[PDB]
Amino acid sequence: IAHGDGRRPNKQRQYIVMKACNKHHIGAEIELAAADIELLFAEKETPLD
């Protein structure tokens, strides 16, 4: 608050505080059949039934 007329503040304070990021670990598993990966990508790029 501004000065004057019987009002004496504890004049402007400034912190500088260094805080930490906190790491979090998330695991997931995807299982894929090897038949689909191989048939959808072939050297002979003729279309599929």
């Binding site: 059949a33 090897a34 038949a35 191989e38 048939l39």
Partner: protein, 49 residues
């Protein structure tokens, strides 16, 4: 002292579709046999009387 010759076998094989054994089987080569687990083809066979 000499080195009079240097020789080596070359292996050639008659593959399956060129033998006479394919006269006793029908060959239908499929793209990826890992796709289907079990074939369970069912036949309705009817005798005459």
């Amino acid at each position: 002292e000499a080195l009079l010759g240097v020789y080596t076998n070359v292996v050639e094989f008659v593959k399956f579709l060129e033998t006479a054994l394919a006269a006793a089987c029908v060959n239908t080569e499929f793209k990826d046999l890992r796709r289907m687990i079990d074939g369970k083809i069912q036949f309705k066979i009817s005798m005459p009387t």
